[PDB]
Amino acid sequence: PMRVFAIGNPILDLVAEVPSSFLDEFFLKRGDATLATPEQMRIYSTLDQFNPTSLPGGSALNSVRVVQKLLRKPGSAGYMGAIGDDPRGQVLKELCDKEGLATRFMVAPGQSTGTCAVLINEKERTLCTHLGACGSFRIPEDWTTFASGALIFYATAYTLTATPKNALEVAGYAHGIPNAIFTLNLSAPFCVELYKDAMQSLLLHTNILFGNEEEFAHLAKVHNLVADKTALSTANKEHAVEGATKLVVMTRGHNPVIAAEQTADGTVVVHEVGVPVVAAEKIVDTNGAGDAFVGGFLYGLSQGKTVKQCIMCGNACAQDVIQHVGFSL
Numbered sequence: 419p420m421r422v423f424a425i426g427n428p429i430l431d432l433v434a435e436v437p438s439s440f441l442d443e444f445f446l447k448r449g450d451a452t453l454a455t456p457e458q459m460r461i462y463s464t465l466d467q468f469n470p471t472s473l474p475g476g477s478a479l480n481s482v483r484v485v486q487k488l489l490r491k492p493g494s495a496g497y498m499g500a501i502g503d504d505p506r507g508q509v510l511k512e513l514c515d516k517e518g519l520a521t522r523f524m525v526a527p528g529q530s531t532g533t534c535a536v537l538i539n540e541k542e543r544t545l546c547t548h549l550g551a552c553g554s555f556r557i558p559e560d561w562t563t564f565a566s567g568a569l570i571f572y573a574t575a576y577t578l579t580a581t582p583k584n585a586l587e588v589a590g591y592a593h594g595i596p597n598a599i600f601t602l603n604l605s606a607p608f609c610v611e612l613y614k615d616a617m618q619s620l621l622l623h624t625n626i627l628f629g630n631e632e633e634f635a636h637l638a639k640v641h642n643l644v645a646d647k648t649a650l651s652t653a654n655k656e657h658a659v660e661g662a663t664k665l666v667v668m669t670r671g672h673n674p675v676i677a678a679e680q681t682a683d684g685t686v687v688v689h690e691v692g693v694p695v696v697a698a699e700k701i702v703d704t705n706g707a708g709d710a711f712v713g714g715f716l717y718g719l720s721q722g723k724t725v726k727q728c729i730m731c732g733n734a735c736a737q738d739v740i741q742h743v744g745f746s747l
Contacts, residue, residue, distance in 0.1 A: 419493045420520060421720040422485050423565040425573035425588055426478025427552035428499035428523050430510050430533035432462070433543070433744050434470035441537055441544060451534075451545035458535075458546050462506070465535045472533070473745055474514045476552075477574040477605065477709055479521075480745045484713020484735055485720070486519055487747050496520035496565055500555035500580075506531025517747070522564050526554050536744050541699060543744065553580040562591055569598040570720050572626075572712070575605035575613070582616035589623035599662040599719070601626025603712060604633040611636055622658055627666035628712050634668055647676040648688055655680070661723050665689075669711060675733070679725050689725045695737050706745050707736030 441448065444458050454461065475483065478497060486495045501507035501523040510531065514521050534547035555577075558564070565571075571592040577585035589600035602624045604610055610617070610633045617637075621627075629637075631650075638650040645653060647668060655666040655678055668676035677689035695701075711732030718724070718731040739745070 419491060420496050420565065420568050422482065422495045422570040422572065422716050423568045424478040424482040424495065424497035424521070425555070425557070425584055426497070426499055426577055427476055427532070427549060427555070427574075427579075428474070428479060428501050428507070428510055428521070429476035429547070429549065429552055430472055430506055430531065431475055431536050431744050432465045432470045432472045432533050433536040433538065434465050434468050435538045436465070436468070440464070444546065446537065446544050446546060448539065448542065448544055451547070454535075454546045454548045459548065461535050461546060462533060462548070465537070472509075474510055474517070475745045477576055477603070477705070478572065479514075480706060480709035481572070481574070481603075481712035481716065482519065482521070483517065483745060483747055484710055484732075484739075485717045486517060488714060488717035490518070492518040493520035494518065496522060496568070498555065498557065498561055498564070499523050500526050500529075500552050502526035502529030502531050502551045504529075504531035504551065506533055522561075524555065524558065526551060529554060541702065543702075549579070555580060555584055557584040557587055569596065570601075570716055571598055572601045572716055574603050575609035575617070578609055578613045578616055582613070582620065585620060586616065589620065593623055593660070597662075599625045601628055601665075601712075601716065604629030604637060607633050607636045609633075610640060614640060622660060625660070625662055625664060627654070628715065629667065630669045630671065630708060647690075651676050652678055652686055652688060655686070661725070662719075667711070667715065667729060669708060675711075675729050677725070677729060689729060691726045691729050691733070693733050693737070695733075697737070697741065700741050703736075703740035703744070707740035709745070710736035710739030713739075
């Protein structure tokens with residue numbers, strides 16, 4: 419059952435399909451995902467009537483899903499995340515429920531909930547988000563009991579956005595025993611650049627480094643150096659120390675994924691797996707598919723493990739993910 423634990427911001431999605439105008443009413447433009455402002459708050463209610471089949475998710479959330487469905491069993495994945503005393507959450511728990519998820523979401527007093535109006539076109543989406551009724555997770559002191567037995571720990575770097583205590587206090591315990599695993603996902607340029615001093619420690623208490631070129635480069639620019647794939651991949655991994663050892667998955671968009679295993683005698687190997695993705699316009703989902711990669715990676719991770727295997731697995735996670743709607747499981 420429980421064999422993967424995720425910690426992040428529980429966020430809800432409101433995929434719909436709004437005529438251009440609806441869209442223009444809330445000055446959003448097509449091919450945009452941004453942080454909702456004051457006039458875009460009354461929007462949730464709006465798209466809360468249409469015909470929007472809203473699903474649960476986020477980053478750690480979507481990533482887990484995978485993992486979760488990848489399994490098929492109930493409570494095989496738990497996740498902790500801040501929710502508010504809001505019906506946007508009340509549905510955020512029963513919905514995450516039916517999926518066979520064991521997430522624990524504390525409720526944020528008068529904090530309200532948080533979703534992301536996911537306007538579209540015939541496929542082309544525009545998302546408006548409100549990440550703040552989700553930023554007040556203070557890992558419960560007994561959270562280790564709730565995840566008690568789990569050996570695969572995860573959480574999105576976003577987590578820092580509130581306070582790096584949680585994702586801080588998760589790999590510190592995780593490090594205690596029993597031979598579990600800590601994986602962190604670079605998240606955005608903000609997390610990376612707008613975080614530093616926290617990641618330096620997190621980094622070390624990190625067994626798995628998940629991310630793409632974009633920030634690995636904004637991460638590389640954060641540490642003493644220069645430079646490429648092997649460049650940053652092994653240069654970013656090149657930090658100190660501590661088959662679940664010290665990974666760093668350098669997803670190069672389409673270009674081959676690029677990593678490296680760290681073999682007991684301390685010998686650095688570099689894992690390189692392209693990405694046979696045969697598809698058309700049925701792409702577009704830069705997140706939801708990188709959230710997928712992390713999914714198979716932590717699924718096939720709880721099931722045998724294997725360098726290219728796990729990395730070559732999330733491939734058909736995103737591939738199959740970036741395909742269907744915003745995280746259509």
